[PDB]
Amino acid sequence: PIEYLLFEEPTGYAVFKVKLQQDDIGSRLKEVQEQINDFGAFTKLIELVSFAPFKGAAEALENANDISEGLVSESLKAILDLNLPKASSKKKNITLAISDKNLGPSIKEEFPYVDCISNELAQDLIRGVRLHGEKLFKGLQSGDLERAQLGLGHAYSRAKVKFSVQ
């Protein structure tokens, strides 16, 4: 039960739907790690469902700062609101897989019907997604990921140091 998983990206958020689970007793195995490493075996597990890009670089910087501090952003709340199915708020909650235990409780507070997961298994899925990157986007447009990394890294670092034209 790992139904959806989130992935943050320098050009916005991506929400994937998991189709088949690797069995969680042999998750330490050579064969499951090798099928994570191979691309053609990953798409049987993960298909993209939504991908909302950031508007501008300043919005990207502020949203990255909010992810760093561990809070939820307006765009993130909008994406999850559009994507996740509203189930009953008492039993049978919808399972979202994320990467941060610190990000867990804010997601849970904003959506009482969702349940965050950051396991070794969820970290393995996010690791595979990060490894395969633009091949998983099926032709959907994105910026050059590495150029986005460089720009956002410099902007975030200048913000945390308070660099100055003086």
Partner: protein
């Protein structure tokens, strides 16, 4: 299984939602051999 059409939580989440909602609330041979064999 939620969609973009219906409202999800039935509570205003933005200022747009709450303002328009409160104003609408105001507005209400061979043969022999073979035989041998």
């Amino acid at each position: 299984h939620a969609s973009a059409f219906t409202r999800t939580q039935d509570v205003p989440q933005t200022e747009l939602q709450e303002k328009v909602d409160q104003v609408l609330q105001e507005s209400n041979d061979v043969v022999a051999e073979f035989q041998e064999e």
